[PDB]
Amino acid sequence: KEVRKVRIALASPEKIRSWSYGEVEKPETINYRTLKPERDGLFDERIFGPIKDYECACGKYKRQRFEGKVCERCGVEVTRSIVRRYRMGHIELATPAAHIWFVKDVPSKIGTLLDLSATELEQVLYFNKYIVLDPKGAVLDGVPVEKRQLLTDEEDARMGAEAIQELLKELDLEKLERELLEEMKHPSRARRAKARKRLEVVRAFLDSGNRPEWMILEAVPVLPPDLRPMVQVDGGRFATSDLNDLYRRLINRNNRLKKLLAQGAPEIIIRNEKRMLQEAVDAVIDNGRRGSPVTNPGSERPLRSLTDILSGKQGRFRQNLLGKRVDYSGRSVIVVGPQLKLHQCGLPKRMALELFKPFLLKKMEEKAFAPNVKAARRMLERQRDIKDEVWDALEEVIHGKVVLLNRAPTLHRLGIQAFQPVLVEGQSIQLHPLVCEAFNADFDGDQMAVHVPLSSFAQAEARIQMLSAHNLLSPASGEPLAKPSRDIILGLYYITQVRKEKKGAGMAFATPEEALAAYERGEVALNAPIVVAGRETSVGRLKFVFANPDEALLAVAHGLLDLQDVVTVRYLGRRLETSPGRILFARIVGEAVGDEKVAQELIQMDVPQEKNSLKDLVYQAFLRLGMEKTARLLDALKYYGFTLSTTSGITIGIDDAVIPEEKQRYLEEADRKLRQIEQAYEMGFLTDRERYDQVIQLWTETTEKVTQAVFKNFEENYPFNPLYVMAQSGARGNPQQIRQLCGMRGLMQKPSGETFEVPVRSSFREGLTVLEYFISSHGARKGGADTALRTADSGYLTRKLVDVAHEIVVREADCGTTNYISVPLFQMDEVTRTLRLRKRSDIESGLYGRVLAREVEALGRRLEEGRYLSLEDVHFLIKAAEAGEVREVPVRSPLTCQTRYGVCQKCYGYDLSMARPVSIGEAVGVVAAESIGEPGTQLTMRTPRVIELFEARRPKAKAVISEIDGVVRIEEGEDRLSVFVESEGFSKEYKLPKDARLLVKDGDYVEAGQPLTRGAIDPHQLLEAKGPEAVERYLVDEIQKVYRAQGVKLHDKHIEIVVRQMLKYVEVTDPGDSRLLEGQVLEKWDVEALNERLIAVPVAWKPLLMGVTKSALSTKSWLSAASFQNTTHVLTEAAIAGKKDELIGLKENVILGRLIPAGTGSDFVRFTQVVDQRTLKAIEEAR
Amino acid sequence: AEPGIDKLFGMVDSKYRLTVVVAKRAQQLLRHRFKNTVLEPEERPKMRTLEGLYDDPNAVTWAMKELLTGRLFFGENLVPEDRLQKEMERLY
Amino acid sequence: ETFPIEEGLVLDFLEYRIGDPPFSQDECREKDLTYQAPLYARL
Amino acid sequence: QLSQFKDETNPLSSLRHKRRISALGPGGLTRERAGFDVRDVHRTHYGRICPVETPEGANIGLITSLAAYARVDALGFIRTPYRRVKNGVVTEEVVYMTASEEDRYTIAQANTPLEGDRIATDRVVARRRGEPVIVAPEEVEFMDVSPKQVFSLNTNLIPFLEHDDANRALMGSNMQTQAVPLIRAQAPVVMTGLEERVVRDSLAALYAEEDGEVVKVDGTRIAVRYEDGRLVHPLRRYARSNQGTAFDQRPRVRVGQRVDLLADGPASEEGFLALGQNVLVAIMPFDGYNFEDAIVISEELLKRDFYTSIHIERYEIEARDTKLGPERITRDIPHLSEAALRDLDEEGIVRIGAEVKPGDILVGRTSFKGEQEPSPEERLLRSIFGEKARDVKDTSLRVPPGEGGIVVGRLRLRRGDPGVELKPGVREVVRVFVAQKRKLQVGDKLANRHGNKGVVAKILPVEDMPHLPDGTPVDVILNPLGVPSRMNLGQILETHLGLAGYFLGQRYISPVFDGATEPEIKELLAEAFNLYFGKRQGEGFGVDKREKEVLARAEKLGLVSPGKSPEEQLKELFDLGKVVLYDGRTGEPFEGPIVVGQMFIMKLYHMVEDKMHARSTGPYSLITQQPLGGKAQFGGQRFGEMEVWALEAYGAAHTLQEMLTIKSDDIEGRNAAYQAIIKGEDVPEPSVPESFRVLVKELQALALDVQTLDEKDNPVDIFEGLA
């Protein structure tokens, strides 16, 4: 058959024995002082007691057995457990117990009235005074009160923890009561709960089988996992296991009990013992109380009791769910260097081999090499320098096929890609540049694993999606990625930058003079004039739209023109001004696609330079071209992409860092200004804190000036020459990193939160005054802490993300839903209490490729309702916008689309990455959270604000909201700067302490009451004072705000395909049928349950907002989940109710070794295809 | 990237659905007897490596390139997943 | 500072003596044994 | 914990440990990545008696090192940096003295300067001054006493260590922690004679005693002295280090001289702490074989075996002895009998001076043992060929995955012996030694002293390279970008001043926050040019088309001044920038005043042949039922989480699942695989998990169940239960 819905839950003690089947009880001799194995009691091989001479009867056939002594054809030698399960029976019959009954008050606590001591009896010390028989001191009832001796005042009724096992087959039929009976306790308010949770309690059981068989009478531990034995080398051996010595605790007790009672052990003793079992049971289970250290007394380690390990987090569960292991894996160092780039990959002859060893043999079969594979490995032995023709074969395992390539760490699916292969020499693996960026991890000699998918249905299920030349061009987040990052730029950048060395501005009369003459001295590639031209003359260099302007390249070919933008007159489509220092550009990028014709348009030549407009060109080539070229092209800026930077170079010299000879002047100045500034406070005017802000605010500003300077001396005096320049404009290098270099850089601040008197005595071409390279250090190291915190805190934020979002897939395409959501277009800037126009990016990555809402009339061209707004179009509105016919463009994203079944097609703007709207199937769920796959490092735990909200945590202070709206109300007073609101109906007291003192004379629904101008308070009250209205937003833009001050090339889709979650949940409100007046049920189900059922009664829900983590936990299933804080707790209310746990849930499948319903596995694609006409014309006559 | 890859992704309903088809008409293809693909003359890719040549044993690429001959369809056709072996005799 | 561990019945701590490494250097590295140096103390 | 098995790598590193210093350990200040507070905490401070460039980034701050002038007399309680008081007197009342301020070694002249604005300090701030007034002692303590006092030691040893970002240095004041006895050593053209110590006080090399006069045999030992009579002298013989270093001690002398040194050190030269090999170098790119941040070596860097070393791995192999099977070491290895053995090994142990390669038996052995008795068809073979049967499972040593090498010797041990402190219940503890004349293939890390981790690109075979107009090619490159423009530094002054070495012929001493400056190099770059240009101008030429032409742009570029014939101009270029240069590729010139200058190259520990683990099925572990097993192999490779995600990010179903399927823990699936392909074509089996099968029971442990429920409720599947 084939797996499906995964059931679980209880298995009443009656069941224990079922699996238990038999085997157990007795003692657990962990071996003999002699022949190590067996013991005839514990991990004893089922029916193996030295020479049982039996048991082999149960087995039908297969092979012989029964060898009298020693051992027969049993499992002990082979098939011993076979890693399979083997249940033990436990002899357990003693009093009671408790399978932990968790830490949420279930399987007891609730189902009575009990807790805070529901264990005052269960853990023998009180009594659940069951038994009806006229009490005395004030009636009896049926619940704990036998404070010992009292249950001796009568001298049923028992302290014994068997009472839970008592009212068991008892308050079971009364379950048809609790169902009835209880809930009937309606209204009054407050107390409205309990019974609520109580409902499920009963409601989990009932027509959902099971029993309160939570009382225990037969723990059931296996044996396999332990019988591990002697480990040598280096410096120690001897060998043993845990869970067993942990197990023992039990049986011994449960054994000593019986024989220590039968011999009449009156009262006191009895309980004090028995209970041992109880405690002894909280063993194999969860060590959560006082502990049970080994080495007893032993003040040490924790017994691996399913806590911190096995089931826990990061021990077994968090380990074997994803922390698995390939088997053809491996690793290696890191290289780079022109090859064929893309689809190509380093990989070292030998190193490789093995990965392919299998087939290797195979090909060697029929085709020479060797005969039977038998040998094969027999030839791969002790590095018998194979080489000979073999190598000439491995490339038949290689050839065409491909492999992967990962990185440590990984915060981007880019993180793998995978390249086809080839092979140079020596160890260490090479890789093509760009990809480098897709790892933002320099070449500090790092390594990278190179797994290798083997299954044919995995390869195609790779390269054509994995090939580094596919999901690396324009990537998720927004912009592109497979661009020539550093270096390559300079290599070309150089081949551009006009050059105007300025020599003069004489004059001419059309070449006779000046032109001719001047070529003796004075003037050159300057301004000049003959009637309307400068000095782009002398060399005509012409041609036609053929295959060579000829001259140009051929002109410089000799000791003539300077390839670097010297300026001659070109000829291609028509009289070109440009120099070969740019025409070449085209040609190459031209030769890529064909007929420079196209290049022309696309490219920008009237401002070459190149830097941040390269992303573009490629990025634009895309839309208009399509991968199969992007490669060739993006893969040309490779060859030449280097040679230029090569046959040109551009070193660096202590010198090169040019001190701005217009410096020592600026400096001097300020100080002076300071001089008095100080010889001012020093007199009698302005408190210290005053001049403080001053002295700083003097260089705080003097700086920028010094900054300004250098960034020009360069761009006039020594344009490109100062290589320390074109490395910051755009190519590889920051700006406030040069002024640091040459300038001065000296604002420098203290440790905690104040700024230093003096600044840095730069002239970094000269030393520093100790204190300098000191206070500098002060600030310097703090960077360090921020970087390691982010990388180490990422452990809390990315995992939760990845989680809360998960099932988000997209089968089908056309759930045509209503309520559109217009993307904001103009934001109130609180610097300008008017309206700016947004950086024109948030828009971009906030509308870049989307699925329009309702018509787009404006500027003459009409954009039909429901259309994928191409980048080309955002402009069409972006630039357009101005006019004023659109201030809120419409479209639909995840802020609506009632289908938690996935996310459906065309609802996720375009599809970011591949030029096209969401392909079908795509498990955006991934990319989703994997969107925040370039944040971490880049941020600041060190306050962290990217979650204060993300988890709906009522922030720090928040500066509380404005409940509703209406009447101003500005009541002045003593020390309570409390301003309020009202309007003939009602309101309250809004106290704004000795903090914000900003008024207002109007109303406003919830604005902010004006204290926290930034980030509304806890939406936990906004949704309340509004609804998902403005609670599926705020954050949405309130978030980005933590990215809009740290680059970030994402928005739109991604971060908005997460929210949906956080609120989806609901808190039922007075319905009928599916019960749970309180409840918390899932979204979409409610719909269905307020649909199919609609055809009756009501189900009236109520939007509800949680957090994120809380969101991740308790979900549509039970399978996934766990992986968090309350490991047990979820498994608790997991069993009970049959809980079948649907299926569609990837993380699910994965674990359960089932295909992941998505990508190329989900419902949408089971498709077929094979058919070769006469084959399809085979069943076309055979059917 | 992939030879003609651009003529793929679109000429379908969506990425995966493509890749999918591919790796089927592969085993099914070559793995079900090398001589099976639609290609006829030399349009059948080769591997002119060292001194000698031969059809790339990497089947996987035939299909890619096989999806360039009008032949072959893809979709809920012929429900007898078994009968895909109905040819498993006509091609032996 | 270590009271003469109580229970007559009273122990006493008087003077030490050390050095005399039972395994001179190198030897130890040829094998193992820390270059430990035992002591004693009259009681 | 703290014990940090000494990192005796180089002679230095080690020392640092004897210092380092941490608030970590058992005292309460403890774990990784915070408790309650740790981020806002151990930040910087108010203690100059410590460098601020040594931690790292992880358990940062909580680890560093004390400094030179610091902790004398009363170190027993709270650090105490030395202080100067104008003349022959000294004080250091802890790093607590924050009363009366102090000066910071700047400007002077026989006890008193003239700054008139004493660059002094109060507590933390840095007020202008207030020349206390009287040369009559400092303002109760004022004078850096010397510059370096501010940093540890693992610091005051880098060139213009007053010209780079702090974090550049940092990512340097720890690289030095990881060197390598290139045997050749060199002691940097640039440096601080502190190396006068470094070695000595760490006792790398050796020393002396009063009288003098050698004699010696050299070979292994060394002569004596005269004073307190004769006195032989051991040494090293490569010896084992706690990681590989393998420290030797070649020496110096010949007859009689007593100052006062004696025999070299591991990484050493005449008392001058040498660590790396300062070959030439030169900024600029080349076929980007230096992208992001990489280096380019020249095969000649192998010719003269400049870069190479050695590492000793002790191989511990035992044979306890149960009661079923007794493990021993007869050179009469079973089943597999071949010349491959008897010739080299023989009688168990293998003679010294034997070359070894992967899988090569190291100490063949036996072991009785009968775990899996007689096979079926196998019998059809045990005779078919007639090799009868065996009785002692091969059990051998066989060199790990890979380690072709030599043998500095062996070593045997045994029970009941007086000196044998073996683990009870055992006998024998074979312990053979092997070292490996390293090298430098393609991958190892180079890095300098100012922060520039290498990563060999593609070493060149002479022909190519930058051919100096006078043949000399550039042994080393190091294209800018990465950390130069980025994460800034100075070093470079370690290039220019450098060339004033292969040429000028002198080496130099460059202190910190003092001396060695931008004009210095000039006055030095001086005689240098006249010199070099000299030769050629009196040897054969002076100014050539190429060598000249460039100079062209040199001007248009915004550099050379349009002056005298190509001489003058060609000069300048020197000074700072570097002379012409061409290219062993095309042969043209390198249009641009390139830069060049012997500097410093380290080649840290992170090699490659040591940091690599490739394989296939190899492992296959039990209990875990997941890779990690082999009395030969021993690799791994995690895919754990993330790695996953990113994969499902696309539709690698059959590939994603593939991991957790066959290539992970499908057991049968495992074999189904190898067999599958081994055999031939076939989409290896679908799948069947396992680790899960585990969890199930693992779960069922407690009162649970796992109806592997089927399709439409009632089918109900509980698959796994036998098959």
Ligand SMILES: [Mg+2]
């Ligand atoms: Mg690193």
Ligand SMILES: [Zn+2]
């Ligand atoms: Zn038997």
Ligand SMILES: [Zn+2]
């Ligand atoms: Zn939709």
